[PDB]
């Protein structure tokens, strides 16, 4: 009857099942009954890399949540009974930076600032919730649990592609085609680009070959120079621009960043999507010679969640080949498998 | 009677005076009688760093030219007798990249692609010439020779400031306040920013204090952290934004680039204006945390030369405190003095 969460008591300690009572809600809170929560590099950071959470321990992680609003504060009652995706990052929506949001000084994330989605239920602010059309979901052969990874995994690269002005005629180049990079490929394709997938993993390439990558390049097989000349071949074959390439570093490695920076051409955009604390060695002045720009992406404004979901509902992109469902009570095994890079798809924990 | 040039026969060889005959011009060429040619880091690169020129030696350097059109091909005759600034870089204006220019694959520069302005006369294409209102020049206590440095030295940072969307309420921060950086300060001020001048040279700061720098910070005296906190003081004093700072790296050093990258704040723009082949160590992912962008500037579209000159004519910026006039036949002494960093202003060689 009572809900439960699986919490981190300490980084690397076994996750502990903990019942909790909802009680009275504040005016602008809802309870979502969790269908699914994605397992993210950000969660593994808290657990394995002991990254500080803003909420004190113990804390349930998980910030990629779909489910149903089953209880609501008086101001949020219009959410009752509706299928939703919770935004991974909720800007204050009231500060001058939100008025004019991704960097909002008062932005809040589940599984960091408040109790997360590795739970039967999660209490979240109602601001920025994305409704799911349940008819359209069912048609597409998708569970409500499946669209959990629209939060962050789809929306982060959606924001990055939109911000880079990816348009028909363009070559899009994405480095690191697991997780976020996989969706950068699918979305750049949907936006009208001819996409080049670059990864060290042949299986990832094979997969992206079937879902929007017009070209694949194994970065193990091929140094900086062959990389460029292979993409120009692709461009000239299909009558595509040889300038103004839209490059997305999605691996979040120094190796990927060196490799992406290496592929700058005249008027190109380099989108920095993958987070790492690693420093690279680059000559900043390459940006000058190419009259190029480097655009830093942080997450995704909630306002874009409906459009990203729309891509999924309409089969313009595919989630199903990129997700795998596990029991929430196997969170330990899944965390351990994701950390050892044993997972070939994004894990969704399901109560 | 015959014109003459001072040519580089070989990098580091004494410059040699060489008479030449103009002869018949092609349809779209003019002869400018040189009033003045600026002495640029780019010239010193050819001479001291043996950077390859596209024209074979011997070659007269100099690409920052003002003077009078005294002869013209039939298609260019409307230029005859007019005071001009020659663009430092002339895009083809006919390629699809110019149609839609700074990076144009067919772009031409005096003192690199064709004979330069260290000469009594220079034969240039008429495309992109900037007329000078001689009445307005005289009023402002300026020689026609003086506006030679509008080419590159003023226009390069004009392009960079325009491209960064520098607007009232903004804090502009320019690192390296000699030459191009000095004009980035003056132009950001004219555009409505409150400008912070950062340099290692106290005399440069003193100077910029008098010409658009609302604040000066000696980068010798003060590490990364005090730098930020001093600028926030300035911002809060005058009611200015603490985000979306417009940062211009104008020194073209790794030291300056590290220092500028270090000053990224939320929504900031980092303009890369100074060229160097030096590589820096930075975490590219700072661009993400700040939702920031890095914009590479190459030169300036000829179309902006009238607006930049307009700033000079109208006293909105000042050239006079930033120039020093020398005889063209002292090119050797001036090259040697600029290379040893003995010059406190931009040298203009005058026939
Ligand atoms: Zn995530
Ligand atoms: Zn806000
Ligand atoms: Zn120059
Ligand atoms: Zn062109």
Residue numbers in the entry:
A (entry chain A), B (entry chain A): 3 to 102, 105 to 355
Task: Please give sentences taken from the publication describing this entry.
Among the few candidates, the alcohol dehydrogenase from Thauera aromatica (ThaADH) stands out with a high activity for the reduction of the cyclic α‐diketone 1,2‐cyclohexanedione to the corresponding α‐hydroxy ketone. The results obtained confirm the previously observed preference of ThaADH for cyclic carbonyl compounds over aromatic and linear aliphatic compounds. This preference is in line with the physiological function of the enzyme, i. e. the oxidation of the cyclic 6‐hydroxycyclohex‐1‐ene‐1‐carboxyl‐CoA within the benzoyl‐CoA metabolism. The overall structural fold of ThaADH was consistent with those of many other MDR−ADHs, i. e. contains the typical C‐terminal coenzyme binding domain and N‐terminal catalytic domain. ThaADH shares with many ADHs of the MDR family the presence of two zinc atoms per monomer.
In this context, we determined the X‐ray crystallographic structure of the wild type (WT) ThaADH in complex with NADH, refined to a resolution of 2.60 Å, as well as of the double mutant K319A/K320A without cofactor, refined to 1.80 Å. Second, the K319A/K320A double mutant, which was obtained with one molecule in the asu and was refined to 1.80 Å, but no density for the cofactor was observed in the omit maps. Four cysteine residues coordinate the structural zinc in the catalytic domain: C94, C97, C100 and C108. Resolving the structure of WT ThaADH and a double mutant and comparing this to related well‐studied MDR−ADHs with preference for phenyl substituted and linear aliphatic substrates, gave novel insights into the underlying structure‐function relationships, which in the future might enable the rational design of MDR−ADHs towards acceptance of a wider range of diketones and their corresponding alcohols.
